[PDB]
Structure formats: structure tokens, C-alpha cells
Amino acid sequence: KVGRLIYTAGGYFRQSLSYLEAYNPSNGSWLRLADLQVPRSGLAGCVVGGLLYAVGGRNNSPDGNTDSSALDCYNPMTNQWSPCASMSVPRNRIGVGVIDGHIYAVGGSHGCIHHSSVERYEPERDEWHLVAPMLTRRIGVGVAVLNRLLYAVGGFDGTNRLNSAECYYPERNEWRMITPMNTIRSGAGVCVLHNCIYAAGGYDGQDQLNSVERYDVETETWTFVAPMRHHRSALGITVHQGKIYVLGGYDGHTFLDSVECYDPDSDTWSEVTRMTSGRSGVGVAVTMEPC
Ligand SMILES: O=C(O)CCc1ccc2ccc(OCC(=O)NC3CCCCCC3)cc2c1
């Protein structure tokens, strides 16, 4: 379990960013690592087999806005990024989950298109294939995996921000609605901790949120837990050693540098560190420290 860092990739502040930075919860230190080949915001990060993957997003720059179909792989042993097979379609404001070594890319936008499509990456073959689409088009969707089931939570369908959520059952290649959240949330941080799917922050169509709710997959209920110190939309999120970490986002005024940590045993949030600069729309995941 030792030696793991929280990696943050990409993001947005005035334009899309290429930063790869890694935080060590054990000593508070931050490292700046190899830049992404292409700056991207609205991407997702995940880890398979010790490799960090950056999936999708958009490059916003003064010279254009290009939605990304890219899958890129970072190896901490070499501090190098390598291109992987690209997705069938660009996906900005994507959600990603991993089941049994396979990456699922969910939703996202391509220009004015709001995707319901979903595709699955096989690292051993370096191939993507489409799977069943969701029941709802969703961008800014939160995705997490619990007990080898894939959840897609909230988002924006092109007309309305959503409180709905749905679950993908891989052995039936089928999506089913689950109980909707109590709050409409687009751009929430969604993760899994113990037996619950957590949805932190987001935008409800009127304000950035500090509220946090969790779905118990056995009881099928959503329950609020302690709110974050900061309202945040387009935040990064991950779980590490039994605690949720939220990174950055937008509070309606500032692009935040704050990182908060949720302890489920005390039901409290604490501010633990600051990123090197405020930013939103980052991809976050946890893997071994680099060499
Ligand atoms: O339209 C809605 O309902 C809300 C839209 C939404 C939802 C999720 C996002 C996730 C990442 C993401 O990255 C790029 C990103 O930070 N952009 C913007 C968000 C922060 C403030 C405005 C300027 C930058 C964007 C997202 C946008």
C-alpha cells in the first residue's frame, strides 16, 4: 500500500492545461512530472496495471477548441507519456470507470453533440469497442465502479442538468435507472468508498454546490453527508486509504487550489493541501510514485 501518490492531470485556468503533478499524502510534497503531449481539460484519469491513463477532454486555447478522442498512458517508471488507441469519438466532460482491467469511457460532448454512447478499452489488445449506450445522454457525468457494476451519475443531457443516475450490468450489456439523487448535479465529483457511490459538489443549474450525497447500493437510497468547506463544480476526485480527496474546481468566483479530504468515520472534511495553482476540470487517479 505504501508509495502511492495522487496524480492530477490537465485542467483549466484561462485555457486548457498540460500539467501532470503528483501529491504525496504521507509528507505533503508535490512533484511536477512530464507534461501531457496535448493540453486538455474535461478529461478523466484512471489507473490500470500501474499505468496512468488520461482519457478524452478538450483543448481550449486562444487558437481553438478541439474535443479529444485521445487515450494516453503515463508510466511512472519512465516519466513518459505514450499514445494509446483513440476512442471512436471525441468526448469532452467525460466520465471513466475501470472494471476488471478494462476502461469504460462514458458520455461526454463533441461540439453540440451530447453522447449517450459508451465504449470499453482492452489494454492487452490496445483496442476500443462500443458497448450498450446509456438510457440518457450525459456530459459532465460522474462515473464510478462498485462491485464490478458501473454507475453514471448526473450530468447534462443538452437541455437539462440531471439528478438521474443509471447502472451498467456488464454481463447483460444493459443499463438500468437507479434511484435519482436528491440534487441536480452536473460536473460533480463521483467516486466509491466502502459500499457507497459518493457525489460531491457540481452545479445544479443555479449555483456551485458544497453538498455531498452517497448512494448505498444495497438500500438504493441517497443520503447527504457533511458538506465540503467549498462550493465546487468541475472538481477532481479520488479515493486513497479510505478517504475521499477533492481537488480544485470552480466556486463561482475563483478557480480553487484547495484540496479537501473526507473521513467517513468522523463524517468530516478537512483541508489538507493546495495545488500549485487553482484549476478546474482535472483528471485524477492514484498510482505508484515515479522514478
Ligand atoms: O453545463 C453544466 O451543466 C456544467 C458544465 C460542466 C460540467 C462538468 C465539467 C467537467 C470538466 C470541465 O472541464 C473544463 C472546465 O473546467 N470548464 C469550465 C468549468 C469552471 C468554470 C467556467 C470555466 C471553465 C467542465 C465541465 C463543465
Ligand SMILES: [Cl-]
Ligand atoms: Cl489506496
